[PDB]
PDB file of C-alpha atoms and ligand atoms in Angstrom:
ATOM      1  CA  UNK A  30      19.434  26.556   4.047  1.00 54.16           C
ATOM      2  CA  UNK A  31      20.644  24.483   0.891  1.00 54.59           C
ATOM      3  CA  UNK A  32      19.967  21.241  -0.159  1.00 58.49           C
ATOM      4  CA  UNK A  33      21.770  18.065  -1.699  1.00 61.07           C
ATOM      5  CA  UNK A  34      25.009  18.905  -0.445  1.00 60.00           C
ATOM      6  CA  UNK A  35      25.826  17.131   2.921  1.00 58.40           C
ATOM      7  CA  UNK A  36      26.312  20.188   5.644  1.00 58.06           C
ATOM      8  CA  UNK A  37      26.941  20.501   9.115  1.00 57.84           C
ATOM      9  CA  UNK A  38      23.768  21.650   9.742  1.00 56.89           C
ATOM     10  CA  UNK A  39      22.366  22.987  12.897  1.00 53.89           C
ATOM     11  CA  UNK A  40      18.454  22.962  12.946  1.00 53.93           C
ATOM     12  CA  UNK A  41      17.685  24.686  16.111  1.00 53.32           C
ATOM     13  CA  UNK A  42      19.948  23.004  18.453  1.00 52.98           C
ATOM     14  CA  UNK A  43      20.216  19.396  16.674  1.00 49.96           C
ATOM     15  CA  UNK A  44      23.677  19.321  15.088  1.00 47.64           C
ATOM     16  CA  UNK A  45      24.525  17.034  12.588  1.00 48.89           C
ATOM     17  CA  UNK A  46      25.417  16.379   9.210  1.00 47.98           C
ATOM     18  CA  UNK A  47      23.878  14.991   5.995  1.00 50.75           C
ATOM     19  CA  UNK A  48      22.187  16.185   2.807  1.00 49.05           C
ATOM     20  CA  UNK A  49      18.514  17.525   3.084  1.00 45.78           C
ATOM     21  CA  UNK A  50      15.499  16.717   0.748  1.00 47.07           C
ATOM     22  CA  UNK A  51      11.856  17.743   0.846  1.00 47.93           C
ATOM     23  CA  UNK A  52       9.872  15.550   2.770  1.00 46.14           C
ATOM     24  CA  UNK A  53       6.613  13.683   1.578  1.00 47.07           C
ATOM     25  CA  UNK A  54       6.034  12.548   5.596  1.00 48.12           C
ATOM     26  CA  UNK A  55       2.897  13.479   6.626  1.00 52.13           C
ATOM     27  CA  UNK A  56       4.049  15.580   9.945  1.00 54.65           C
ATOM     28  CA  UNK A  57       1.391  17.061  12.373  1.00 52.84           C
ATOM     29  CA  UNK A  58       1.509  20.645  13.445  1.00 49.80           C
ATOM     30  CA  UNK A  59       2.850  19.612  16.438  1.00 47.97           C
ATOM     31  CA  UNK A  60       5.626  17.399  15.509  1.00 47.62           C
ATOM     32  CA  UNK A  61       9.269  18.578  15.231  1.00 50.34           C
ATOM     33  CA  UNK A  62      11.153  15.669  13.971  1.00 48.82           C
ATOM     34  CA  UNK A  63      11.463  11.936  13.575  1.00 48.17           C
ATOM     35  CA  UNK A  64      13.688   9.367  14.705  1.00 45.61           C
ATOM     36  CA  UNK A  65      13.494   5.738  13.058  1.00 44.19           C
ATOM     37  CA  UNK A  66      15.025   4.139  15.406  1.00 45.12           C
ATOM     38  CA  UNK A  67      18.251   4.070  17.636  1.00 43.75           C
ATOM     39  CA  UNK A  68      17.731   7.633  17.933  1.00 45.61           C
ATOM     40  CA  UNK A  69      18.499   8.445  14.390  1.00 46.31           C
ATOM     41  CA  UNK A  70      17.330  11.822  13.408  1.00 46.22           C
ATOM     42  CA  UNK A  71      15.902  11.004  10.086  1.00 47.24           C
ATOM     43  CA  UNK A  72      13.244  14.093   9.315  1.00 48.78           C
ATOM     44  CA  UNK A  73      13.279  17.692  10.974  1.00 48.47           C
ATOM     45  CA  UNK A  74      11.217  20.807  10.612  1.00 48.41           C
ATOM     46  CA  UNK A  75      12.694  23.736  10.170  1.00 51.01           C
ATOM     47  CA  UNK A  76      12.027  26.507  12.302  1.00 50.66           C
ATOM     48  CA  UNK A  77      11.435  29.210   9.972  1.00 49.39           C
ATOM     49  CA  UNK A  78       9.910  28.111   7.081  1.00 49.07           C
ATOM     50  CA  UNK A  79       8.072  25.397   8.601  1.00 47.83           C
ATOM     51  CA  UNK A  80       9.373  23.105   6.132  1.00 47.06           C
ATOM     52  CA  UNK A  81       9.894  18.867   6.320  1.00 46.56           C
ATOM     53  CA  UNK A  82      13.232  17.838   5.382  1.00 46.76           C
ATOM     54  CA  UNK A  83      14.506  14.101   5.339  1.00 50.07           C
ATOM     55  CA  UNK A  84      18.326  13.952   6.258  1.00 44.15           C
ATOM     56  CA  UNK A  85      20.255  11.166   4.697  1.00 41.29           C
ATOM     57  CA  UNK A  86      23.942  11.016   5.441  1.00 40.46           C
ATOM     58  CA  UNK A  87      26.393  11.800   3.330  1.00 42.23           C
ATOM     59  CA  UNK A  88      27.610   8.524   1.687  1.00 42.26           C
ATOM     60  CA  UNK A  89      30.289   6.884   2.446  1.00 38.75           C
ATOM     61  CA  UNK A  90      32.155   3.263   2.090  1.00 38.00           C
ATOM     62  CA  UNK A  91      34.974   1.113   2.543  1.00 37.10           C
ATOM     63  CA  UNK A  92      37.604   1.522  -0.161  1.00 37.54           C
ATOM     64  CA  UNK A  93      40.033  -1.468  -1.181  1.00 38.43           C
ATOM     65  CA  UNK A  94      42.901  -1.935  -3.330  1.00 42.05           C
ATOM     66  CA  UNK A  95      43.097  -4.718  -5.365  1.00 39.49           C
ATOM     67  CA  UNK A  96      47.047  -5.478  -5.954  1.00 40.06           C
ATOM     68  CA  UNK A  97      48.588  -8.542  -8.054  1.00 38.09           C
ATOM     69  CA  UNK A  98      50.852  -8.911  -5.591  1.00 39.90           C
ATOM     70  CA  UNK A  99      54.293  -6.836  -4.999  1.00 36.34           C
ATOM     71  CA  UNK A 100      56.883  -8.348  -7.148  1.00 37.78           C
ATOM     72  CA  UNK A 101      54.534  -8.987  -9.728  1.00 36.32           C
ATOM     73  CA  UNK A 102      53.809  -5.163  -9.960  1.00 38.63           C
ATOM     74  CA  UNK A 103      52.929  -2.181  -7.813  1.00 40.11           C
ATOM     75  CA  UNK A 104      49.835  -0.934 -10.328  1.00 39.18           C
ATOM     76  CA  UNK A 105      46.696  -1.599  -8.539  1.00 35.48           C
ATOM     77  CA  UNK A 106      42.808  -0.869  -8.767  1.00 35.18           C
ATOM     78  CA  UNK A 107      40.046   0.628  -5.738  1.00 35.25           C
ATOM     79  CA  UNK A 108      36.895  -0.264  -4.808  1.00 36.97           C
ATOM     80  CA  UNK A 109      34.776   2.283  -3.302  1.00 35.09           C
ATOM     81  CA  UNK A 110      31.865   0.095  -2.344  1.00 35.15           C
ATOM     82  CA  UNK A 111      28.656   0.718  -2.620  1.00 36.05           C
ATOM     83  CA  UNK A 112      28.678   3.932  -3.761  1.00 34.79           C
ATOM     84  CA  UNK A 113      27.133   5.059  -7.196  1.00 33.26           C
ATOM     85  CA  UNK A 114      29.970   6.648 -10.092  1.00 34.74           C
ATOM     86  CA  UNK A 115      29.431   9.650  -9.223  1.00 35.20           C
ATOM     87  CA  UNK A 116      31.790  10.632  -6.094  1.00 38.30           C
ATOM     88  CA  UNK A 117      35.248  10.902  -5.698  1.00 37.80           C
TER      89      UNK A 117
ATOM     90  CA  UNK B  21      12.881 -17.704  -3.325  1.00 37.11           C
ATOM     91  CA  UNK B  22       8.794 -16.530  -2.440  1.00 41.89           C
ATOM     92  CA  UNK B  23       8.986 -18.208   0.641  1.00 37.32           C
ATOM     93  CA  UNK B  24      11.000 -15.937   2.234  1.00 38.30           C
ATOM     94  CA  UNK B  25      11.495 -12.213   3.538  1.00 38.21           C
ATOM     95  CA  UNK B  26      14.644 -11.181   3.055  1.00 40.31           C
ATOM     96  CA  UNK B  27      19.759  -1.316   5.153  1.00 38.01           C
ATOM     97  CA  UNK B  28      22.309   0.310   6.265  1.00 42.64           C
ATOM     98  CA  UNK B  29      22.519   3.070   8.808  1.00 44.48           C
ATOM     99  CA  UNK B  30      26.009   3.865  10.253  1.00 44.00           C
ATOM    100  CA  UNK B  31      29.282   2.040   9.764  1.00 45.90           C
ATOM    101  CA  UNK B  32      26.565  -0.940   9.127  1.00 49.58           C
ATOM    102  CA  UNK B  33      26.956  -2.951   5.786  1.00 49.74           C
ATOM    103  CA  UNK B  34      26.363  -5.386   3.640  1.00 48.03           C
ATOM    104  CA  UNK B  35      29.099  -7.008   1.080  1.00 48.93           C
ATOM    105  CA  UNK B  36      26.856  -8.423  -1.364  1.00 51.78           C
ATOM    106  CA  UNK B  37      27.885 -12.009  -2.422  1.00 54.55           C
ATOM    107  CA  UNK B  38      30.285 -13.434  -4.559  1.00 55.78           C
ATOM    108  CA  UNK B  39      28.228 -15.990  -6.113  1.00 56.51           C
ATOM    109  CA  UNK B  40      25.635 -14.234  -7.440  1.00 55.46           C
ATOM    110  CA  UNK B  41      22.289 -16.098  -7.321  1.00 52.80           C
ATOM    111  CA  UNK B  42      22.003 -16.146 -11.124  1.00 50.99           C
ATOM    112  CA  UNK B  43      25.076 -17.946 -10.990  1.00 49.47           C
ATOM    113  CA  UNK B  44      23.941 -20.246  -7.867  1.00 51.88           C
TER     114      UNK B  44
ATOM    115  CA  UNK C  11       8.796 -49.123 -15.859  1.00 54.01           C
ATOM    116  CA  UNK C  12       5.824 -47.037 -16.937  1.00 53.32           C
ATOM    117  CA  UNK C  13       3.967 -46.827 -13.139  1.00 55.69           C
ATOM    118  CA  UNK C  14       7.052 -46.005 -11.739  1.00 55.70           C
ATOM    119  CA  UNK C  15       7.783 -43.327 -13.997  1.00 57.48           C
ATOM    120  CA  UNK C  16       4.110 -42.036 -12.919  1.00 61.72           C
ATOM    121  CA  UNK C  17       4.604 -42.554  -9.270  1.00 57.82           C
ATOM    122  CA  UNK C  18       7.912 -40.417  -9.240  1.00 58.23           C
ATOM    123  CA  UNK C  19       6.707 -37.725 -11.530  1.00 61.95           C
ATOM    124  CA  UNK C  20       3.259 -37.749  -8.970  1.00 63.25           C
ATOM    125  CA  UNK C  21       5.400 -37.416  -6.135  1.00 62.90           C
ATOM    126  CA  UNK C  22       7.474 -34.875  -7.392  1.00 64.02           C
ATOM    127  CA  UNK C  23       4.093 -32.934  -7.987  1.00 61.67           C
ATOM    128  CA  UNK C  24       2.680 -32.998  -4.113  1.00 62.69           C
ATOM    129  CA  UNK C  25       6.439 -30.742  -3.509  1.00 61.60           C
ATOM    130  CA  UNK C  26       5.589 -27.961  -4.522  1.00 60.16           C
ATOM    131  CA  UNK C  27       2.025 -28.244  -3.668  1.00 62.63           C
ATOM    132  CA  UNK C  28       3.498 -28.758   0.535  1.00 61.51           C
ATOM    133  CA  UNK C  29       6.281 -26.024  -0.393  1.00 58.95           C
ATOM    134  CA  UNK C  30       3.526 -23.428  -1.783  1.00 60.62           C
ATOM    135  CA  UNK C  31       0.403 -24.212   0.684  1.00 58.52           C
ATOM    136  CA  UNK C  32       1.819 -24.783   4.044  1.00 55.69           C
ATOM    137  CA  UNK C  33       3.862 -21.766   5.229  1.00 58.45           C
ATOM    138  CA  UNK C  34       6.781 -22.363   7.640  1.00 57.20           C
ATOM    139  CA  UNK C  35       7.639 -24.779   5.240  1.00 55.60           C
ATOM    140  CA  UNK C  36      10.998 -23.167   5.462  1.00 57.55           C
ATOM    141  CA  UNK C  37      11.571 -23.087   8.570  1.00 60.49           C
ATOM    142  CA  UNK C  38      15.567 -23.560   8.854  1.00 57.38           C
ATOM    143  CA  UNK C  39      16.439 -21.171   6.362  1.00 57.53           C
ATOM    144  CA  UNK C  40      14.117 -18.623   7.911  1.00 57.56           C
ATOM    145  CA  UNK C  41      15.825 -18.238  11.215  1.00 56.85           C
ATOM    146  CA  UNK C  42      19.152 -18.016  10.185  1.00 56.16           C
ATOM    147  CA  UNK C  43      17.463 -14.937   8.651  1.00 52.55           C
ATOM    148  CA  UNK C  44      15.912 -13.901  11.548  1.00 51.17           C
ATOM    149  CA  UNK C  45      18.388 -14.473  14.220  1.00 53.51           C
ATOM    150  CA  UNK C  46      20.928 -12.955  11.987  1.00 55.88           C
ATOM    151  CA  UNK C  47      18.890 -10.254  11.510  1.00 59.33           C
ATOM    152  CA  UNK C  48      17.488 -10.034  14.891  1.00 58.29           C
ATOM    153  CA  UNK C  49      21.314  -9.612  16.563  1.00 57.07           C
ATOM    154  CA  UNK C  50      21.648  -6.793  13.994  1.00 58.63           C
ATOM    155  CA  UNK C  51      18.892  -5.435  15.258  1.00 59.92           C
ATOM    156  CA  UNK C  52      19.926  -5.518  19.129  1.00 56.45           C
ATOM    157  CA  UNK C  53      23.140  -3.691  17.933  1.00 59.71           C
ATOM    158  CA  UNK C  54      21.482  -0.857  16.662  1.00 60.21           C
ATOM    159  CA  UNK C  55      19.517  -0.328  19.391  1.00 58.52           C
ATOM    160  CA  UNK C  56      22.660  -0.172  21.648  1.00 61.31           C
ATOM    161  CA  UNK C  57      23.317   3.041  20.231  1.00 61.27           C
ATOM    162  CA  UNK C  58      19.978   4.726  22.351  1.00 62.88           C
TER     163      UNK C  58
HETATM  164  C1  NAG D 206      11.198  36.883  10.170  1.00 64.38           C
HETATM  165  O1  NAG D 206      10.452  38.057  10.497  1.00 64.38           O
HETATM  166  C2  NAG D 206      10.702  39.179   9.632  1.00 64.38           C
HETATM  167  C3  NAG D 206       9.836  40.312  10.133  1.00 64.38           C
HETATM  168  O2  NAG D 206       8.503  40.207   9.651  1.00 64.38           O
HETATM  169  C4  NAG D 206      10.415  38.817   8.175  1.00 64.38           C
HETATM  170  O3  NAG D 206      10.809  39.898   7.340  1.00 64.38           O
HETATM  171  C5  NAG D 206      11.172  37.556   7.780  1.00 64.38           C
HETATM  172  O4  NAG D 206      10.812  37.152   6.464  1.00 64.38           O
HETATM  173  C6  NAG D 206      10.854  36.440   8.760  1.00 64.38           C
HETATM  174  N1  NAG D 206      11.552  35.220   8.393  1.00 64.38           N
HETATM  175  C7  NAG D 206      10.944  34.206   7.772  1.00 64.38           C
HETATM  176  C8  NAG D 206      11.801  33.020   7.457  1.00 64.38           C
HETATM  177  O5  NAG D 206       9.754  34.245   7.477  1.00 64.38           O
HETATM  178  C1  NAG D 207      23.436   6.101  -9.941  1.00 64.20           C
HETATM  179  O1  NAG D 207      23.125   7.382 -10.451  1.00 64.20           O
HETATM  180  C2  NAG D 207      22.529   7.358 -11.756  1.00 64.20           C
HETATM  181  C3  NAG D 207      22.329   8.798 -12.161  1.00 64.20           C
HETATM  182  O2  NAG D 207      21.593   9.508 -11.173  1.00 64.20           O
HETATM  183  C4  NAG D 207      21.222   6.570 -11.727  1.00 64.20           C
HETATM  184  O3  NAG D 207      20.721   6.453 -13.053  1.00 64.20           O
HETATM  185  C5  NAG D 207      21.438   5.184 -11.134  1.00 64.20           C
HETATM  186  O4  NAG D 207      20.185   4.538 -10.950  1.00 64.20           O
HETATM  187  C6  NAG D 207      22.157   5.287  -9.793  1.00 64.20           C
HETATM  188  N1  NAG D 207      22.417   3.967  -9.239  1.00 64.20           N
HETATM  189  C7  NAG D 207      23.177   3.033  -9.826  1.00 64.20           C
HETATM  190  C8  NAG D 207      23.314   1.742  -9.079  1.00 64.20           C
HETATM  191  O5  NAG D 207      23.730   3.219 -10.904  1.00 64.20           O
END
């Protein structure tokens, strides 16, 4: 397994996408994942190492252009919305 | 602004507003 | 001119006093929080 790069992960079945982190949620020894709500998958226990992982998916936004018009001039900006300077 | 209680999961947003409450 | 200035700077004093010891003081603005909110909520749990 990695970590902090969203893959299209398949833990034992579940198949999905997203980017993993450790998990600080208390599981039991008899709990193999948690939903949230609306049946999102938001923590999952790996098989093998018996590890908690939180899965967050990768981020994404709507992006608009921001043009002055067309016969004005044809240079525009982008918004990627909420999303932090540090993707594409 | 105490008086009151106040995420995003999939294809869910929020565009924040243009007035910012500073500027309110 | 002088008692009136005190009676309108008393009353402005009981405001906040009514705004900061009853709760559901706000009662208007708080729905439109909560129903808006609530439908959001309904449409999530659609997905299930
Ligand atoms: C699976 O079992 C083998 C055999 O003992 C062991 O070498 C391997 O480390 C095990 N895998 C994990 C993730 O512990
Ligand atoms: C974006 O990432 C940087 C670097 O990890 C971090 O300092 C910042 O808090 C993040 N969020 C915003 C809104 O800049």
């Amino acid at each position: 397994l990695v970590k902090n790069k969203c893959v299209n992960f398949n833990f034992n079945g579940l198949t999905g996408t997203g980017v993993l982190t450790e998990s600080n949620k208390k599981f039991l020894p008899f709990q193999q994942f948690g939903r949230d709500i609306a049946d999102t998958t938001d923590a999952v226990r790996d098989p093998q190492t018996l590890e908690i992982l939180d899965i967050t998916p990768c981020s994404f936004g709507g992006v608009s252009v921001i043009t002055p018009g067309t016969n004005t001039s044809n240079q525009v900006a982008v918004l990627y919305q909420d999303v932090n300077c540090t993707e594409v | 602004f105490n008086k009151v209680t106040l995420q995003k999961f999939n294809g869910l947003t929020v565009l924040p507003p243009l007035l910012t409450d500073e500027m309110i | 001119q002088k008692l009136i200035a005190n009676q309108f700077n008393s009353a402005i004093g009981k405001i906040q006093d009514s705004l900061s010891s009853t709760a559901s003081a706000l009662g208007k603005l708080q729905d439109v929080v909560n129903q808006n909110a609530q439908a959001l909520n309904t449409l999530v749990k659609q997905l299930s």
